[PDB]
Assembly symmetry: C7
Homo-oligomer: 281 residues x 7
């Protein structure tokens, strides 16, 4: 029953991504440089990498990064998510992976982006599991489709997962997703950037202090912070539409939005990433 493969031009750019300067640069070095300086790669000899795996807690910009990089390269973007993998897994129809790769090859230059890579693992038991090993029909197909996919087309693959412990190791061997990259929770400074980025296209009241909001937040992932802004907006809109029946999103809106701030990632989980992040890096 496989959904339809949608190529698209990534709407998002580096400006919408708070922080992660280091990876932005590193990403460019992995896709820009090989295409825009093929001369320098031929000069020094070394040939580029097929793909990258982002791992990290949820809501930290694994997707923004995959899209921004596509958009920066002015390239096409295909996004295969968890449920789509799982459909092929449940329906035994992993042959469609071929189709996905076709559509990316034909849409070259293209970043093909497998989000929620771990979702089959999870689906068969995850942490504990069933009988066999990390291999599964669908991811396995991805890996062939990746072995057979000539380095010299213009398709860049990016995987993302927030449960790298359960990912099949074969994904990481040379010639596949070689570059492990950890996208961590946002720090002190980064949370500021993330707020600014999230409010770039918004009428932020002058007084509202984000540098402070950033001090107020921790196990707060980008997603968590975006959630705050949105509640603040929804408050300003409801506060606007109220008065008529005057629009700048202001202090007391953020204040009252803060009354419902959650943290998606708990400390245990965070700890767990550092463990993953230690061996994995």
């Amino acid at each position: 029953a496989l959904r339809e493969t949608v190529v698209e031009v990534p709407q998002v750019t580096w400006e919408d991504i708070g922080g992660l300067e280091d990876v932005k640069r590193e990403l460019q070095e992995l896709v820009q440089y090989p295409v825009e300086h093929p001369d320098k790669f031929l000069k020094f000899g070394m040939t580029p990498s097929k793909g990258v795996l982002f791992y990290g807690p949820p809501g930290c910009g694994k997707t923004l990064l995959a899209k921004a990089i596509a958009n920066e390269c002015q390239a096409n973007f295909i996004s295969i998510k968890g449920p789509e993998l799982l459909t092929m897994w449940f329906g035994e129809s992993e042959a469609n992976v071929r189709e996905i790769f076709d559509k990316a090859r034909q849409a070259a230059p293209c970043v093909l982006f497998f989000d929620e890579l771990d979702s089959i693992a999870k689906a068969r038991g995850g942490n504990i599991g069933d009988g066999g090993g990390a291999a599964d029909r669908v991811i396995n197909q991805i890996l062939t489709e990746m072995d057979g996919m000539s380095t010299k087309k213009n398709v860049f693959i990016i995987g993302a997962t927030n449960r790298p412990d359960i990912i099949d190791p074969a994904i990481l061997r040379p010639g596949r997703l070689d570059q492990l990259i950890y996208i961590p929770l946002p720090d002190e400074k980064s949370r500021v950037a993330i707020l600014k980025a999230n409010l770039r296209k918004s009428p932020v009241a002058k007084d509202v202090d984000l540098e402070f909001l950033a001090k107020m937040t921790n196990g707060f992932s980008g997603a968590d912070l975006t959630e705050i802004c949105q509640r603040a907006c929804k408050l300003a809109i409801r506060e606007s539409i109220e008065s008529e029946i005057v629009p700048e999103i202001r202090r007391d809106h953020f204040e009252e939005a803060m009354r419902f701030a959650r943290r998606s990632v708990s400390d245990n989980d965070i700890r767990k990433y550092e463990m993953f992040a230690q061996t994995l890096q």
Copy 2:
């Protein structure tokens, strides 16, 4: 063997819903405002949400809310319930979820409402379960059909469950059912409203004291309260048809109706929802 997908116009409005003022407002803000004020959403930038998940104990108005909102927006309403999901699960026919989504897309503006979202979970063991993870072929389909369903059609998805502990987490990721909303048991005041709402289209004897009946009921859910009225009616009808072979539903009818008042939700369960409600919110 899939049943026939029935589009319909929701018969029920906010007046038939006792209490829940806060959510009613919140719901409007999620569906009315984006459609009737696209200008304000484009002004502040933020784009609306695809869907909502109501969780709560049974008989508290999760359906009334999904219908009232559709009716308020003067929109179509499709309802897929537990047994329908289970059919596709037993018959391995989840491809029909595509059909359901077509039917909703084609009937846009539409609220597509998946009640008893947890019923496959229960069916495969629930709390304890089988080998694998939360994923199952049918919900997974819903999820694809929801990824592939352009935000810009006019289809609004609402899930309902009373066993949110067993719902697949993927349902809650961004771009799906983002808005968790808890529909709790009705409180002191609310029970009054619910009784009034339930008796709006009825000859209530003047003396009959609802504010009191409300004090009399606790772990009483909206369903439970309705049940009382109905017994009161059935008593008045039986008491009417009796005299001939004089119609206003009166004090002693409710009194004798009360002699059979149950509570659908037990305190343990209630406690469990607060647990769910704590982490989940």
Copy 3:
């Protein structure tokens, strides 16, 4: 391999049912009143119920009731029993439930009556069971067919079970078999009515004291009582055909019939029903 669906006109009336006055009334209030007084239901607003679940020990008239009600309403009666459900279960042919529901809809006004509701439950392990939850492909089908079956046709559904502990709870949700009704063992007075009813069409000797027979019997179900009469008859018939090679069924025939009186329901079981009957009501 599904048997052939037989619509029929119920041969049996209230006179054949001993005792249960309360439920007889209640049953009428559930099917008569909505049809023969649609005006009063529209006046008070409340809309009628789709169906009813009788539970209780075996041999207490859960069938008699389902039939007599159909006959009173001068309606058609379809009976699906255990073995029929089991056939669909074993043959994986639950699509036939559809056909049954068609045949009912087409023979409207009709009481469709699913006796032995629990029989698949028993078949898969019952009290202890297999892996999964209460759902099974066949009952589930009944539930879809019932969700999809417009309230406004003229089909009234009635389930019966004597193992309501193993019934799938979904069967009891609103819009399904909402009305739980307990048909208990016959009491003191009831036993007399049941003997009278069973002998209505019989030459009972004048002396024969039933009010006494009633005192003699306890965990005696209607079925058990019928069994006595029958042995009494068989005794009179054998006693008759004897003399020739003089017909009124008399004292000493009942006396000698009593020499083989069993009780189908044991006290433990009975106790169990009260437990079921406590939570369930």
Copy 4:
């Protein structure tokens, strides 16, 4: 792969059956009286029974009874045995049960006799068993075919089993095999009858004392007793053919036949039947 259904006229009569006077009478009262005195059954009202279940240890005449009764009523006899049921079970072809019932219906008046009723139960594990409950596809089909088989045809069903503890209880509900009948090991007097019956068509030497042989035998079933006579004959025949290369089966033949007398039923088993016989009656 189902065997061919053979209608036949029962060769055996009451004379060939030793003892069991009580049941012979009872059997007649259950099949003769309703057919040859429909007037008396209509007079007293009571309607006849569809069938009967003999249970008992093996070799006690459960079969002879089923045949004699058919032959007395000058009726047709169909015999389905264990291996035939099992064939349908293994081959999943229970739909043939229909065919059998057709053949019986078409050959009416008929006794349809299911011997070794328990043989599926045994095959699946019996005493201990598999996962599920007493129901199985094949017996179940017998049960439908019997519900759907109008009381008013002329087909009388008889089941036999020596392991009633493992029979599905549904077989015993009203309208099915209502009449449980225990066919016990032969007693003191009966053993004499059984010997006489078995030798009715034989040249028994005048001196040979059976009343004594009867004293000599206990856990001896009809079958076991027959076995003795046969060894006696085989001895006389071998003793006859011997002399030529003079025929009356005599004392010393029985004497030397007794040197190999077995008892098919052991005391534990017998005990077990009394347990079954206690609750079951």
Copy 5:
């Protein structure tokens, strides 16, 4: 994949069978007498038996007996062995049993001989086993084909097994293989006969003392004895062909043949047969 059913005329006669005089006689009385003296069977009334089950340790002449008796009756002989039964069991092709029975019916007068009857039992686990009871699809088929096979054709069925503990008991019921016969290890005298028999068609040196060889051998079965002779021959042959590059099988050949004498059956096993033989007879 079922092998081809071969009818044949039994090459072997009573002379080739050492000992077992008692059963030879008994076998004749079961097959000769009914056919060559139908008058005497009709005179005394008793009707003959359908078949016989030989059980006992391996290499004791269960096959010779089955053949010799066919040959004596100048009849055809079909031999179905273990691997052939197993083929039907693995292949789920027990319907071929029908074909075997046809071929036998058509070749009448015939002894149909199912050797290694226990071989499916063994194959599913034997002594310990799998879930279910003694029934299996293949043996079951044999049983039906035996119930349906009219007594009045001329086909005589013989089973053999050396693991009667795992045989299905149904095979022993009346109308099937009624005659249990134990073929025990050969005794003192028998071993002599067996040697003579086995040497009937051989140049045995005059001096060679078999009555002694017989004293020398115990847990020796016919097969074991045969094995000796064979080594003795092989010695003589090799001793013959040697001299040229003088033929009477002599003392020192048996002597040196004895240096390799085994016993196929061990005392434990033997003990086990006596146990089987005790209850079974």
Copy 6:
């Protein structure tokens, strides 16, 4: 997916086999003598054997024997190996065993040679195993094809296994692979023969002392010894081709070849064969 059955003329003769004089003789007595002296077999009566099973540790000449014998008899040779059997096992295509047997029958006189007989047993768990008994669909076929294969064709069957403990016992019954033969590790003298045989077609330097090499080697199987020669050759060739850019394989080559001498069979294993060899012989 069965491989293609290849008839061939065995290239190898007794000269290429070191040691095993006793078996070579024995083998001849089992195939030569019956064919080249049918008179003597008819004279003494005894009829020849259908086949032979060689068991022993690996690399001891089980194959060489099977071939040499075929070649001596100037006969055809078919070799089915482990993976071929396993293919039929995995693919459920044991019907091909028929085809193999045809092809052998048609190429008669022929030695059909089933090497690695135990490989299915191994494949299903071996020592510990799965649920059932020794029987498996493929070996079982080989047995039928061997029962059905007339003694009087000219096909001689030889099996080989180094795990006789796990071989199905049925293979050893009379009329199948009756002759067990143990092919043990080569002893002191044998090792010399094996070296000479292995070097028969080689320029062995005069000085090189094999009788010594023989003293140096133990748990050394023929295979292991062969391996040494080969390393010696490879040394002489590399040592030859070296000098040009002089050929007799000499002392220091063997010396340096010895620096890499392994033993395929470990003492535990060897012990295990003696256990097998004890009961088995």
Copy 7:
């Protein structure tokens, strides 16, 4: 769903392989000598080997060697990797192995190279496993396709595994992958060679000391060393492109590259290989 079999000419030569002089030589002796000196192999008699199994820790040049050897012989190279094997395993399509072997046969002279030979073993549980033995449908097919593949075509098979403990032993029998070869972690000297080889086609700054880097690295595999160079390059490139918006990869680049050196193989694993390497050699 099997991927497309790609013949190719190996791009890589001995120069690209650091160290392993011994095996390079040994490899040539196994493929060159038989083809380029068929005269010398015919002279000494010995016939060449079909194939080779490299086992060792990951990233040590098992692939390089397979390729370099093909390239040296100026031959074609087919690479079947793990995921391809797994595809046939999951899809039960091992018949494609035939196709692979055809394509290799048709591309002769060819080295056919099965990398990750152990990947099914792993997939079914590996170290612990499932019920059965080492055999599996796909590898088994490889083995047949290797038995049937005439020694006299020009196809040379090479396996590679880093989990030789779980490899099916049958792969190692004569006539298959006879040559076990251990490719160990690179030692002291080797690491220098590997760095040089890895930088052959690179502008290495004169000062940069590799002999030192070699001292710095241990459980460092060729892959791990490569990884260092690459980070050094990436640093020089990033450092180059930086300055414009000057190219020789220099000291401080390696220095900073060293700040992220991992070791792919841990000491436990290393230990494990020595264990494998001890028995296996």
